[PDB]
Amino acid sequence: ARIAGINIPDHKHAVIALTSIYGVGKTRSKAILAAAGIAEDVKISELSEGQIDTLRDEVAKFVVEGDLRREISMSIKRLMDLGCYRGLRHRRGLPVRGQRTKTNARTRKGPRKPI
Amino acid sequence: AKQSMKAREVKRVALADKYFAKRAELKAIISDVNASDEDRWNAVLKLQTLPRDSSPSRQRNRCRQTGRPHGFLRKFGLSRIKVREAAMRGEIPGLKKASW
Amino acid sequence: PRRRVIGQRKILPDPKFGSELLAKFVNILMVDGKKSTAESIVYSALETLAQRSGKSELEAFEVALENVRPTVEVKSRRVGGSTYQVPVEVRPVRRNALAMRWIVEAARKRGDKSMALRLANELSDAAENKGTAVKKREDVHRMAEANKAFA
């Protein structure tokens, strides 16, 4: 249940349960359970214990909760602190990939906000 | 359109169809596979020195009569209005007004 | 329409049984033209009801629709300077057309896990005179006696 930093729920299946980590979706979640010899409709409960003892070996060869968040929020700060155009669209809080902002920039601009 | 734009088009088409030997013997060397990786870098510096207008991308189909750039049709060759004025007089063959 | 008095159109019979009553009822369960899943949900719930009541599969339906046909209802006039409701009697076709519509309007408001169960519950309840169908029927049927001074 306690797998790679933070806990994992037990009632869910293995493939849907391993996605609770920050940095595994439905591709690495089948990479782990096909490079560690486990099925895909057994739960975190009614496993064995050595299966977790090798699943924890398999997961930590990627970059996970610490490393992903530090690398992503490293690269964001690096892009900020030059003057790059993605940097200015970061440090104004406006969409970066070239969205139309005459309307509908709301996911970057937060809420709907009168003057 | 203006009286200069059609002159610009008949000045562009001449260059773009004159240099058609070199821009299928630079893109070959660039987009090949087994060629030289130090000649693939000079055949990409020639392509910015062949003159800019000589390129079969840089021209919009003007009308064959007026010069209106928008609303083309490729098959007739005339614009949105000067196909209507011919097809409602009879100069384009087989072009009856459709219904079904 | 204003002028052309027109006819109520034909319909296919049901696939399984042989009653042209169920032809409207499989249609009112439907969204977006997919009549096959409507033909499936109903023929599952009309077996689950046929088991839970201990009655025959065709006969567990009419004696639960009997408790949700109305007899009279209101419309609106405003002839003079005043809106009147009017208790008019109801036509023998629109009777069933209202009956089979209230049940399906109710059975998309339960909390169960499947449409079959949501309709088997909604038919057993209106077979035992409780539920969100016959309560709506009580409201409609009481707005006649609250307005029988209008006619």
Add this chain to the structure above:
Amino acid sequence: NQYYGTGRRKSSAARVFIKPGNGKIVINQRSLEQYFGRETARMVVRQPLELVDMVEKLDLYITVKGGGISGQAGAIRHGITRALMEYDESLRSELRKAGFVTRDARQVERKKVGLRKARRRPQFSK
């Protein structure tokens, strides 16, 4: 010796052949349950064989091309109700009373100009 029909529903063209026999139903070299999904399609493909009492006496060969799952059912219905009129011909009054001889002249209705579907307008403001 065999008899023949031809029917057209929405966008289908059935082609039916009747012989005296036991009741075999073959469609594009498939048995009748292997082709069709829903029991109403198995109803409507059989319906005029039930209407007159001629399920048992005859076998039939059917080929259908193009259309939808209802098109290749109504087409075979119109096909058999034609092809049984070349069997005994006093079936015709009761098939006509039953309403099976009339080919449905409905078809998909085209999309006009400035109408986002065949009759749906776009929306409206003032």
Add this chain to the structure above:
Amino acid sequence: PRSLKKGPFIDLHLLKKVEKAVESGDKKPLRTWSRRSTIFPNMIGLTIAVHNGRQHVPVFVTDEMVGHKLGEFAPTRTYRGH
């Protein structure tokens, strides 16, 4: 991004100019009206001045910028706030 197998883009009139200007050294700011070049590693430590729409804007280029193109340090339209 570009296709990789064509290699990176740079104008000839800035490539030959920058290989001359390294081997003559002067930090007189080199101006350019070519804001589409992938900055090369031997352009590390130069003061160029890219057009922005109105005038040149000066850009002192370090190790960090060498992936990008010369436009992304010339913000184009001015903005202050409503």
Add this chain to the structure above:
Amino acid sequence: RIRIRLKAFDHRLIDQATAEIVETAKRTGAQVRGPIPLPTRKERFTVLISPHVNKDARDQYEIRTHLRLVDIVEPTEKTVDALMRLDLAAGVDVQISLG
């Protein structure tokens, strides 16, 4: 065998142009395989009419390329020659094709 296409825009001008070929083959010899009606491509076009701003007003035109095809089975020398003697009115295209 020798097959000829006929393309036209008008089926009162394709039929004389094909009867003047069947009554050339059946006057130099025999064994023509009739006209066979191929499919008919209808190249539609839809244009606006108003010169400035009316997106809900349109003219729709079509062009209906009529095909025909004619085979020739056993050719003599005069059978192939009296066909290339023959021209046709404008509007009709041909393309002779041995096999």
Add this chain to the structure above:
RNA sequence: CGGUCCGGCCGGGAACUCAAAGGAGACUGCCAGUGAUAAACUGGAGGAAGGUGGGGAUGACGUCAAGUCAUCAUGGCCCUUACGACCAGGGCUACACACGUGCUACAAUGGCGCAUACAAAGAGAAGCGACCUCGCGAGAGCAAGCGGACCUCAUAAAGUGCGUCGUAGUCCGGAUUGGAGUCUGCAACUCGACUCCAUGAAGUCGGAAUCGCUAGUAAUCGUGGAUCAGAAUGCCACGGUG
């Protein structure tokens, strides 16, 4: 019919679907009844279609000095080292906000994974580009086929069967952001589409007021085309369930 690799494929056949030329067909023509004896109308008989059989094409006289001099032509006027003309780089795409039109959802009539059937109408030579191999995938590699009922684009999806899922911001929903890539293209920084690995916001059917539709219709599902080197959730088309 006969061979058949059980593939109309291959001798064959002209029947049938179908492709298209010319015709037959529907007229209130026929039986009854109400009628002012007429005009019609209401039922029903025959028919594939009943009363205009269903759709389209066609928009009277004219009106608001309606709309464009920016498609084109124009009467007068204004400019002529400029209001003309060539070039690089920017700009139409900015954003505190308001309105109009659409797409995707808020889930069990539904997500995901496996197998399994049935369409129509189009387009294609600087073009459509199958087969075969390398790539997890966009796609690069090689080179047949076709001015096309021959060849391609092309697999239909909704559906049907067997699982999994169990009412949760959810295996619902995909917004936004980071890393790595492909293609057309002189060139994707302001600004291209697309695929993979991450990220998983807002939203539990929506206030007053309002919008479309009378039968193959509304409602949902996919496919094509025009403009186009690349680039539409709109536009124009055709069918599937109904």
